[PDB]
Amino acid sequence: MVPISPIETVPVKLKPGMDGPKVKQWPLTEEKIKALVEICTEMEKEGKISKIGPENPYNTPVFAIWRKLVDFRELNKRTQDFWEVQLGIPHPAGLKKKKSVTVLDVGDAYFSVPLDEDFRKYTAFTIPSINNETPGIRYQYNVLPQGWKGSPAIFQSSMTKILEPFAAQNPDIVIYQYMDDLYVGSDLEIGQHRTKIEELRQHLLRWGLTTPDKKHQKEPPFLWMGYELHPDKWTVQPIVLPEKDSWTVNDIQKLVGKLNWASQIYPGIKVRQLSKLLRGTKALTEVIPLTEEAELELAENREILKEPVHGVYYDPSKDLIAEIQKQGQGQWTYQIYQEPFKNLKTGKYARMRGAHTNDVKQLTEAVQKITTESIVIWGKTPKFKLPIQKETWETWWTEYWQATWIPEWEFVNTPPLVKLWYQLEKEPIVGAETFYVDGAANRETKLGKAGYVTNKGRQKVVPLTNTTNQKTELQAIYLALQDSGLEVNIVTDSQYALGIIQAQPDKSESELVNQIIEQLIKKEKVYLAWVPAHKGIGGNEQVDKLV
Amino acid sequence: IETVPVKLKPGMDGPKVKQWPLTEEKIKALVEICTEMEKEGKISKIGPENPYNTPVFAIKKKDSTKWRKLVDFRELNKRTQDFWIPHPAGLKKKKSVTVLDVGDAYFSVPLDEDFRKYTAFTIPSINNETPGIRYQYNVLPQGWKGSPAIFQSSMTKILEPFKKQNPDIVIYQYMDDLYVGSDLEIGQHRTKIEELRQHLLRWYELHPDKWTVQPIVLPEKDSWTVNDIQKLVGKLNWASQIYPGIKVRQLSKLLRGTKALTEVIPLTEEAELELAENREILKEPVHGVYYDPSKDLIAEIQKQGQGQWTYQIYQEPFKNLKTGKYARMRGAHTNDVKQLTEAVQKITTESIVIWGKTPKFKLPIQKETWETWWTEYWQATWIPEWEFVNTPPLVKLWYQ
Numbered sequence A: 001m002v003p004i005s006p007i008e009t010v011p012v013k014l015k016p017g018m019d020g021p022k023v024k025q026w027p028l029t030e031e032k033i034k035a036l037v038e039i040c041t042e043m044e045k046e047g048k049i050s051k052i053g054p055e056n057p058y059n060t061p062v063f064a065i066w067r068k069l070v071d072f073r074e075l076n077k078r079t080q081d082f083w084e085v086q087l088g089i090p091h092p093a094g095l096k097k098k099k100s101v102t103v104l105d106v107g108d109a110y111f112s113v114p115l116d117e118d119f120r121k122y123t124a125f126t127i128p129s130i131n132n133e134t135p136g137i138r139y140q141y142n143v144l145p146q147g148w149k150g151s152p153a154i155f156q157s158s159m160t161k162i163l164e165p166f167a168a169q170n171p172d173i174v175i176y177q178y179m180d181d182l183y184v185g186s187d188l189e190i191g192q193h194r195t196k197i198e199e200l201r202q203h204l205l206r207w208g209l210t211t212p213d214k215k216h217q218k219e220p221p222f223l224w225m226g227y228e229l230h231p232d233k234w235t236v237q238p239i240v241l242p243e244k245d246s247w248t249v250n251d252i253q254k255l256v257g258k259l260n261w262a263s264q265i266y267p268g269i270k271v272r273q274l275s276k277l278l279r280g281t282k283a284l285t286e287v288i289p290l291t292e293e294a295e296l297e298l299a300e301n302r303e304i305l306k307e308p309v310h311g312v313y314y315d316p317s318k319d320l321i322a323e324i325q326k327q328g329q330g331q332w333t334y335q336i337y338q339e340p341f342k343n344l345k346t347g348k349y350a351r352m353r354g355a356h357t358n359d360v361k362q363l364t365e366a367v368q369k370i371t372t373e374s375i376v377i378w379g380k381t382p383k384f385k386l387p388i389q390k391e392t393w394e395t396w397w398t399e400y401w402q403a404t405w406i407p408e409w410e411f412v413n414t415p416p417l418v419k420l421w422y423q424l425e426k427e428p429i430v431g432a433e434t435f436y437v438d439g440a441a442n443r444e445t446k447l448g449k450a451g452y453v454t455n456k457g458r459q460k461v462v463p464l465t466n467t468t469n470q471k472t473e474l475q476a477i478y479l480a481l482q483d484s485g486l487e488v489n490i491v492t493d494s495q496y497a498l499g500i501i502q503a504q505p506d507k508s509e510s511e512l513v514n515q516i517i518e519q520l521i522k523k524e525k526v527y528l529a530w531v532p533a534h535k536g537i538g539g540n541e542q543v544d545k546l547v
Numbered sequence B: 001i002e003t004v005p006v007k008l009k010p011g012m013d014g015p016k017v018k019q020w021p022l023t024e025e026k027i028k029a030l031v032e033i034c035t036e037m038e039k040e041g042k043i044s045k046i047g048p049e050n051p052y053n054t055p056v057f058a059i060k061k062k063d064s065t066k067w068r069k070l071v072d073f074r075e076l077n078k079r080t081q082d083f084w085i086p087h088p089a090g091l092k093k094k095k096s097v098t099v100l101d102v103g104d105a106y107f108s109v110p111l112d113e114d115f116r117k118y119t120a121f122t123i124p125s126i127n128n129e130t131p132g133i134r135y136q137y138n139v140l141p142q143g144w145k146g147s148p149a150i151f152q153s154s155m156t157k158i159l160e161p162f163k164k165q166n167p168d169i170v171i172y173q174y175m176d177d178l179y180v181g182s183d184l185e186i187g188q189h190r191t192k193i194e195e196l197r198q199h200l201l202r203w204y205e206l207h208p209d210k211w212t213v214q215p216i217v218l219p220e221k222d223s224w225t226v227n228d229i230q231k232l233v234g235k236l237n238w239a240s241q242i243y244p245g246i247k248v249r250q251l252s253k254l255l256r257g258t259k260a261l262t263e264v265i266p267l268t269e270e271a272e273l274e275l276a277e278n279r280e281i282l283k284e285p286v287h288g289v290y291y292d293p294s295k296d297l298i299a300e301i302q303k304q305g306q307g308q309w310t311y312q313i314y315q316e317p318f319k320n321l322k323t324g325k326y327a328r329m330r331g332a333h334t335n336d337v338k339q340l341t342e343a344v345q346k347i348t349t350e351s352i353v354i355w356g357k358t359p360k361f362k363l364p365i366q367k368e369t370w371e372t373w374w375t376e377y378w379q380a381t382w383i384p385e386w387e388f389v390n391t392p393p394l395v396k397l398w399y400q
């Protein structure tokens, strides 16, 4: 016999202060018991388990469906935490084309990885005897049990340690491990590739691990995690939008799932309205009528999802490019590619929940997201194509009160273009009228007043019902914008209104703020000055609006 | 040569912080560095039984083309037991201070066995292809708060001759940095620094004297417009929260009437007297401003434009312990984030020199932008805490 190299065991402990499992065995039928006695006899003959005496106080229930299934949920609750086998799943767009990709089944290596001997006593299980007239058969696991908490991590780390020298001494190939399957790709000639595959089978056999000489079942196109992987391209598994006369909540969640999933390769997918219908529902069986905007959006989705679209694989020798388009209502779409017309992947970005916003902030956020995703997938930041003029961005970031930055980018003339809709002046305007505004409300009756007085003697006070102080302050500014010329100075005491306008929004939840924005767009020059209230600053007439 | 027992605070488990994604060049740099360190025994590979993790990335210090390994030990530091020197109050009063990187010395002292598993870090893989290379430290790691505490005895033994030779030189230690303050000439200071580095070998010009606190100043004008007076009344009203006797009613008396903003208004005599009294009040220091070692230090930064940034360090509102204006231009003329990161590093350094601890920052930047880009310009061995302010503060121009 050729000596088999031993696989180093991983020291495993339980959670601190806890004890091993002690669960009552399920009573089983005579046929199930016989089947489990046969299966466990074979496994004991193979070395996966071993008989134990009565000194072992721990027990884990066993089942059969034969097939033996051990319910390790309690031992999983009591087992230590392990380092995650995978922090995330790879993305197909990050893969690199290979001339040959072979799949090796290392499933027989799963039960060949030994378990820490001091931990085996916690895997004890009992087969009930026939009619329970004898003591049940006591077994314990000598290898990693399927279903135990630490089996995938210990298995993957052991396989990694085994594969390390082979991968090191063969840099001209690529080895990946996923569950009980290995994937070996290379650009070598097919003969050399099969040769190095045989070399890998031998190297794995030096640990007693057997790879089947049988032709593997997996073959192109690989269907994996909702993906189709082809020799030269990748895509998502076929997305079919069903034809429904009426749509419930689970139909809309399945449709937004198919659309979110399809958005990574199909450009232009929008999910704003369909997901908007699911706002604050929390009822799975509730039928919700479909808005017209959801109908137009769904029709555009069916038009985009008409024919199949594929993504290419990553070529590290070419540059990485990400182009962004605005779609309206806080929706953005982007394509990541290296050659024109051939996308690596696509995606979308929806604006965050906010009371006020502008297009430039949303574009900045989208760029940050794309940067993070690209570093995840390809390890580098892509060069951007953005629908915004260089001068627009320069004005924005130079005048913005926050610090901001986007990486290397170039302007692409793809409307709608992100633009600055208004810019406040830095100094007062000579020759322009000066509107001193103010507003006030009663906290009980919700009655208020908003108005202004100007340096030319122009005045206005308007009474308002069902309003607040903040509302009357905004309303006062709005009145000043309404009744002034193209250039106007505005003096307020509202730190609230100044806080809103200095954030430079172009859209808002409040219709009043949107009206103020629409007024600011029409102006040529607007200077907004702030003063402390109730300090006797004339012109600023608090008494005129508190009547 | 002998390990000192180290433990965690009661009831606290080890750190389990997600490793953030890295570029390919930083990953390769960390692979080379960690390979060399593993050959030197400073780190060792670990198995899946170690669930703890601390983030890691790579930087390039000033005047160097070699990559350096930075470990974000913040979570482990706040989870590590408190170790137990009064802060040298004369270090900030010295004319000049030089910062030295003494992090290599820590690697000569082994780390406590049972504690090593808490220093675990992960070199990540691109696109989650491989599980990532996991390591743990066998010696004192740079960035961990226990490293200077454990090495304090050895450091005292190494610095004992130099301290006995020059009683006029102040020596402070914080994390992996050694601050050496003196009053000599720049050439004599550099030769003395070479003397200390060759003294440490066989075993950053900073001038706090050119730093002072900044008072509130008011404009001096011969003609005042309505807008000028309005801004003056606003700034004095803001200053009245800090200084008691600030009075504005005589100046607000001039704003009576609805006048154009650009209209010149002559000051009455009562307004001039009020303004002069206010200047005199602003010339004095703030009443009852003390430092409390039991409280956190808070640092606020405002972007003033044109590469200018203002900052305040305080513990209670309107009780500023330090104020300053960083306007330095060093290869960041087109990058706001780089300027902000350098500003945070300088303010943290000053705070280390003055109080011996780092402040908590309030950064005028969106969380996603900062968290996306700050590691690209970071050059310090320590990392402070920070939060993000999303509403524009009115007081910005009152610090300009």
Ligand SMILES: Cc1c(Oc2ccccc2OCCn2ccc(=O)[nH]c2=O)cc(N(C)C(=O)CF)c2ccc(C#N)cc12
Pocket: A090, A095, A096, A097, A098, A099, A101, A174, A175, A176, A177, A178, A183, A184, A185, A186, A218, A220, A222, A223, A224, A229, A230, A231, A232, A313, B129
């Ligand atoms: C075929 C395959 C993977 O493919 C490669 C394996 C080795 C080298 C390079 C490779 O991809 C290059 C691109 N490529 C792709 C396909 C092709 O036919 N030709 C190609 O050139 C990678 C995977 N993933 C994501 C892993 O994590 C594996 F651990 C897989 C996961 C599940 C299944 C199934 N069922 C198949 C996988």
